[PDB]
Amino acid sequence: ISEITYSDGTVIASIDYLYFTTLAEAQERMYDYLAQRDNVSAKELKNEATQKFYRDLAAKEIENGGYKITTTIDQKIHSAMQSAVADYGYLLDDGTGRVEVGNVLMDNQTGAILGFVGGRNYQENQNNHAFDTKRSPASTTKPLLAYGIAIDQGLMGSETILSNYPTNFANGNPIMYANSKGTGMMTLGEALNYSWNIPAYWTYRMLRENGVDVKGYMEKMGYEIPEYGIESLPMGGGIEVTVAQHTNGYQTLANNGVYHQKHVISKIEAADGRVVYEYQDKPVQVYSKATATIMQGLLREVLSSRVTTTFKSNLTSLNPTLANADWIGKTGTTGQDENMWLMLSTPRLTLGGWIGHDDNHSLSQQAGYSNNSNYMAHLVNAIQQASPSIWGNERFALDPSVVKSEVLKSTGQKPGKVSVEVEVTGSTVTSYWANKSGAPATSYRFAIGGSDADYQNAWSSIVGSL
Amino acid sequence: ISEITYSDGTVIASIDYLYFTTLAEAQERMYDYLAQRDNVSAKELKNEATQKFYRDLAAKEIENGGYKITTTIDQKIHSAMQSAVADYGYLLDDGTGRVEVGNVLMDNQTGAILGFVGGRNYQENQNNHAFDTKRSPASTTKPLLAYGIAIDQGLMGSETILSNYPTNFANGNPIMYANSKGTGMMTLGEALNYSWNIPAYWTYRMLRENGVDVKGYMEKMGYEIPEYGIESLPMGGGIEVTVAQHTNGYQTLANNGVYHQKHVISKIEAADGRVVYEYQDKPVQVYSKATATIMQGLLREVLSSRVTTTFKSNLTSLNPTLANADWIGKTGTTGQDENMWLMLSTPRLTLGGWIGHDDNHSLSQQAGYSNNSNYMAHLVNAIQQASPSIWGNERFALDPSVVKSEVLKSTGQKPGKVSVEVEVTGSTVTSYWANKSGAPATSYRFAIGGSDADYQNAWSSIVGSL
Numbered sequence: 001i002s003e004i005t006y007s008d009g010t011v012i013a014s015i016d017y018l019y020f021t022t023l024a025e026a027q028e029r030m031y032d033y034l035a036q037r038d039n040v041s042a043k044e045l046k047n048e049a050t051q052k053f054y055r056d057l058a059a060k061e062i063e064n065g066g067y068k069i070t071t072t073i074d075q076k077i078h079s080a081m082q083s084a085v086a087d088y089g090y091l092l093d094d095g096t097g098r099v100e101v102g103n104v105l106m107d108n109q110t111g112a113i114l115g116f117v118g119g120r121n122y123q124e125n126q127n128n129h130a131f132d133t134k135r136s137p138a139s140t141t142k143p144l145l146a147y148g149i150a151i152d153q154g155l156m157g158s159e160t161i162l163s164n165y166p167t168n169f170a171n172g173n174p175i176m177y178a179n180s181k182g183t184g185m186m187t188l189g190e191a192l193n194y195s196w197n198i199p200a201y202w203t204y205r206m207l208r209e210n211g212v213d214v215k216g217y218m219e220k221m222g223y224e225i226p227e228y229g230i231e232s233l234p235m236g237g238g239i240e241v242t243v244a245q246h247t248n249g250y251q252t253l254a255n256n257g258v259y260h261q262k263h264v265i266s267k268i269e270a271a272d273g274r275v276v277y278e279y280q281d282k283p284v285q286v287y288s289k290a291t292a293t294i295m296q297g298l299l300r301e302v303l304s305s306r307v308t309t310t311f312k313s314n315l316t317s318l319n320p321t322l323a324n325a326d327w328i329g330k331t332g333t334t335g336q337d338e339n340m341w342l343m344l345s346t347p348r349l350t351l352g353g354w355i356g357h358d359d360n361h362s363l364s365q366q367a368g369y370s371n372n373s374n375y376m377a378h379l380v381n382a383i384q385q386a387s388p389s390i391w392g393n394e395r396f397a398l399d400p401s402v403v404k405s406e407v408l409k410s411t412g413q414k415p416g417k418v419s420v421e422v423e424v425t426g427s428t429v430t431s432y433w434a435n436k437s438g439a440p441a442t443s444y445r446f447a448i449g450g451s452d453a454d455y456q457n458a459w460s461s462i463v464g465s466l
Numbered sequence: 467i468s469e470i471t472y473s474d475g476t477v478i479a480s481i482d483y484l485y486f487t488t489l490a491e492a493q494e495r496m497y498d499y500l501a502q503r504d505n506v507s508a509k510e511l512k513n514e515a516t517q518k519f520y521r522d523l524a525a526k527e528i529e530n531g532g533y534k535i536t537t538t539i540d541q542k543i544h545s546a547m548q549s550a551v552a553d554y555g556y557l558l559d560d561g562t563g564r565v566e567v568g569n570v571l572m573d574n575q576t577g578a579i580l581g582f583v584g585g586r587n588y589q590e591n592q593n594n595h596a597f598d599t600k601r602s603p604a605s606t607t608k609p610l611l612a613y614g615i616a617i618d619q620g621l622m623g624s625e626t627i628l629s630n631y632p633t634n635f636a637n638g639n640p641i642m643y644a645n646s647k648g649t650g651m652m653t654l655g656e657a658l659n660y661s662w663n664i665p666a667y668w669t670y671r672m673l674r675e676n677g678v679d680v681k682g683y684m685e686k687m688g689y690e691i692p693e694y695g696i697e698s699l700p701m702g703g704g705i706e707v708t709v710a711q712h713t714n715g716y717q718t719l720a721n722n723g724v725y726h727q728k729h730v731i732s733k734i735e736a737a738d739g740r741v742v743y744e745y746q747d748k749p750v751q752v753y754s755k756a757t758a759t760i761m762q763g764l765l766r767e768v769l770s771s772r773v774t775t776t777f778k779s780n781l782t783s784l785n786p787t788l789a790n791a792d793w794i795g796k797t798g799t800t801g802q803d804e805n806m807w808l809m810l811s812t813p814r815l816t817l818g819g820w821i822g823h824d825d826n827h828s829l830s831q832q833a834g835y836s837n838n839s840n841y842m843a844h845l846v847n848a849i850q851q852a853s854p855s856i857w858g859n860e861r862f863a864l865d866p867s868v869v870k871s872e873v874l875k876s877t878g879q880k881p882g883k884v885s886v887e888v889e890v891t892g893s894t895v896t897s898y899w900a901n902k903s904g905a906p907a908t909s910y911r912f913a914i915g916g917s918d919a920d921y922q923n924a925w926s927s928i929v930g931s932l
């Protein structure tokens with residue numbers, strides 16, 4: 001009799017979401033192994049009939065063999081997550097009909113998946129919202145694809161200034177943030193905490209203009225994106241992802257820039273002990289340690305500022321000791337309020353969460369800000385109750401390689417002469433950089449993005465202050 | 467043997483904060499009764515020696531008599547509040563030393579005090595922060611003394627516009643809100659939700675100019691204020707109050723404008739049943755029902771907007787069903803962050819809370835926003851656990867007498883002709899009023915407060931939009 005087991009060896013079942021997800025993945029590994037065993041070339045595997053036979057063969061082999069499939073799943077934690085969604089899933093319902101949900105809990109140092117939530121109730125709806133449904137990640141794309149890469153390329157630091165002045169897409173439409181056509185200049189921290197859109201637009205524009213290999217970074221983390229020229233890419237335009245894959249992106253940032261490929265199967269052995277498959281770790285430095293650690297600091301403030309999510313307030317009430325762990329994260333909300341995301345990490349673990357409707361109708365305005373945050377606070381509390389040390393008490397900290405520059409608050413660059421020729425001084429602040437030399441001297445166009453009129457307005461204001 | 471009892475007759479003690487507070491109040495009632503018994507005039511009671519004798523006589527009479535003193539205190543609820551401060555009082559500590567606390571829970575329909583928190587731990591510090599310490603109520607003065615009275619006088623409604631443009635006190639200092647010198651025009655709701663200062667300044671100025679009997683309202687609720695001409699009175703300047711007295715103010719608003727005097731003693735009987743004192747209710751309509759109910763609606767949004775307090779987020783996590791009760795309230799923060807207040811009501815109950823330091827040193831910036839909110843969410847949860855129906859599931863609702871006016875969003879008054887002679891139309895909204903005829907036609911100076919330059923700026927903007 002073949003068996004699927006938890007990480008510690010307890011049998012899940014002989015051969016709900018856990019059964020089918022792990023069985024499906026084991027059937028794929030078995031497929032690759034039987035093909036290679038029988039000396040079938042990848043050429044011959046392009047034949048549709050041959051492929052179909054091998055897929056069926058893999059399924060029957062597990063069915064009738066006596067294999068032991070070891071999963072990465074932690075019995076107590078996964079069982080805690082099930083009870084949490086059973087007991088607290090109703091908190092998601094926001095007056096737009098039953099709300100669906102998916103979550104993935106991943107170890108930051110290995111990529112192993114310790115538990116997940118497939119949906120509200122398998123018995124009523126089988127869709128797997130953790131591994132199967134693909135949806136836009138919205139503003140949770142920003143740290144990975146815009147700001148993270150720009151920092152990594154030495155094109156901004158932690159206190160760099162960006163334009164949030166009104167501007168239009170190529171098609172002529174205003175770039176909107178809810179009902180605001182934008183404001184003025186702002187720090188990277190303010191842009192992240194509020195999730196403003198115009199600054200991310202300008203950052204990704206800067207990457208395109210500089211010919212940065214953005215695709216290089218994203219493909220190293222396993223993302224598939226068809227068109228890298230989309231202006232709204234940092235807003236989640238032109239990208240769709242599963243919760244499991246997107247959790248792998250935040251794993252990379254949390255693990256000091258080092259990607260480990262997500263997995264739910266660690267090993268498959270035959271009855272006699274022959275190892276027919278075993279996960280092989282292939283760590284990749286996607287972002288520098290300086291970059292990753294600088295981003296951890298910015299995402300810490302995203303949660304603490306409580307601007308786009310009530311999560312920390314929800315958690316501090318439920319479990320004040322756990323709220324004092326070093327949480328960082330990012331929210332996302334798509335165009336018609338169709339998808340809400342919240343991604344969370346501590347130094348040890350990352351937990352991705354999505355909510356939305358199977359038929360893509362809109363959620364309420366507050367679904368992501370309040371309901372999902374509350375539900376996810378209950379989820380993290382439940383996981384901690386089942387495994388008290390799992391989140392850990394370590395802090396994220398800046399890597400030694402980070403470069404610290406004294407910069408003007410107003411410009412985000414070093415004090416100096418500028419022609420408007422004028423002497424620019426004032427309040428200064430420490431800015432973190434991931435390059436060699438740190439921040440440049442202040443120049444006239446000091447910010448990421450902005451038009452001529454924007455800068456006149458901006459400088460009018462700075463000069464008025466010396 | 468004399469005894470002090472809970473409301474249901476269970477003995478508290480024969481003759482901690484509960485013992486001494488109720489004993490002190492009973493000694494005062496006994497003093498009045500023995501004086502009148504012995505035919506001593508209020509004249510003779512001005513003699514210091516006579517007074518001293520009667521005070522001592524009152525104390526011994528209780529000591530040696532066999533009186534039964536019935537208190538308003540609910541044993542299960544008060545005992546729940548004690549355990550809550552014991553277990554969760556540490557949540558107040560914010561890195562400025564041990565934080566002290568006081569709370570009072572009052573029935574809105576009677577003024578009876580059902581339980582209270584005197585401090586963190588009587589055994590370590592005896593000061594009674596519920597009944598003895600007087601402190602400025604800060605911005606929690608605004609609803610009672612500025613906006614409530616203005617609405618009551620027919621000088622604003624729910625969507626009236628107020629100036630938050632920069633302006634100075636008489637002494638020449640800018641009116642500040644944290645680090646902001648102010649912005650532009652805003653609705654009453656926005657002014658309340660953010661707790662801006664300039665709008666309250668202008669409202670109280672308008673009351674002074676109109677010669678409104680403000681002292682009439684405040685003295686009907688038992689407040690003692692020495693100087694009504696203080697410009698910062700709505701910000702808590704020139705007023706100090708106990709938590710018990712200030713809770714009585716919010717009782718009045720919550721009870722549809724009807725004040726009932728706070729009390730902890732309901733009756734004192736002699737051993738043979740003679741009633742020597744009994745609370746006599748003297749209800750007073752301080753604000754119209756229209757006014758009170760219009761204010762309830764505005765204070766509901768104060769909590770839901772989560773701008774000055776995390777309370778609703780803290781509560782929704784701890785106890786989602788209880789968070790769905792109809793909570794309204796207001797925060798306060800004094801000048802050097804020396805005192806933080808949060809006052810809460812449902813239709814049945816009001817709970818006042820203060821935190822601060824006995825020697826008046828500053829709290830942290832976030833003490834009121836986060837720590838006190840979290841602690842007070844635990845406190846209300848504990849009270850509900852001890853007495854499941856006590857908060858109630860009723861909603862606050864506008865009184866039938868409220869007048870509803872269709873008004874321009876931009877001006878908060880009815881559409882019409884104005885000279886800048888121009889035709890003013892645009893988006894409209896419903897505004898609630900407590901007078902006969904509702905909102906006036908739009909006039910040039912449409913807002914509460916503002917200078918000539920402010921209005922030019924304001925009208926520039928409105929006219930630019932038709």
Ligand SMILES: *[B-](O)(O)[C@@H](C)NC(=O)c1c(F)cccc1-c1ccccc1
Pocket residue numbers: 138139140176177178194195196197235236308331332333334335336337
């Ligand atoms: B991002 O923060 O998810 C960003 C791209 N989302 C939005 O701008 C957005 C919509 F597309 C639709 C509705 C609301 C919002 C939004 C999200 C977050 C903060 C403000 C507004």
Ligand SMILES: *[B-](O)(O)[C@@H](C)NC(=O)c1c(F)cccc1-c1ccccc1
Pocket residue numbers: 604605606642643644660661662663701702774797798799800801802803
């Ligand atoms: B009121 O909201 O308590 C108001 C009078 N308080 C303040 O303006 C105030 C201080 F006097 C000192 C420190 C902070 C604040 C404050 C309070 C509430 C919101 C913003 C700023």
Ligand SMILES: [Cl-]
Pocket residue numbers: 016017018020021118128
């Ligand atoms: Cl499945």
Ligand SMILES: [Cl-]
Pocket residue numbers: 016017018019082118
């Ligand atoms: Cl499952």
Ligand SMILES: [Cl-]
Pocket residue numbers: none
């Ligand atoms: Cl075979």
Ligand SMILES: [Cl-]
Pocket residue numbers: 006007008009073074075076
């Ligand atoms: Cl396990």
Ligand SMILES: [Cl-]
Pocket residue numbers: 167168169
């Ligand atoms: Cl443009």
Ligand SMILES: [Cl-]
Pocket residue numbers: 212213214215216228
């Ligand atoms: Cl690219």
Ligand SMILES: [Cl-]
Pocket residue numbers: 222223224225240241242245
């Ligand atoms: Cl992908």
Ligand SMILES: [Cl-]
Pocket residue numbers: 227228229
């Ligand atoms: Cl491209």
Ligand SMILES: [Cl-]
Pocket residue numbers: 169230231232233237
């Ligand atoms: Cl686009």
Ligand SMILES: [Cl-]
Pocket residue numbers: 025262263264265
């Ligand atoms: Cl796998």
Ligand SMILES: [Cl-]
Pocket residue numbers: 270271272273
């Ligand atoms: Cl075998």
Ligand SMILES: [Cl-]
Pocket residue numbers: 285287288289290
């Ligand atoms: Cl590195």
Ligand SMILES: [Cl-]
Pocket residue numbers: 303304305312
């Ligand atoms: Cl926080």
Ligand SMILES: [Cl-]
Pocket residue numbers: 357358359360361
């Ligand atoms: Cl659906």
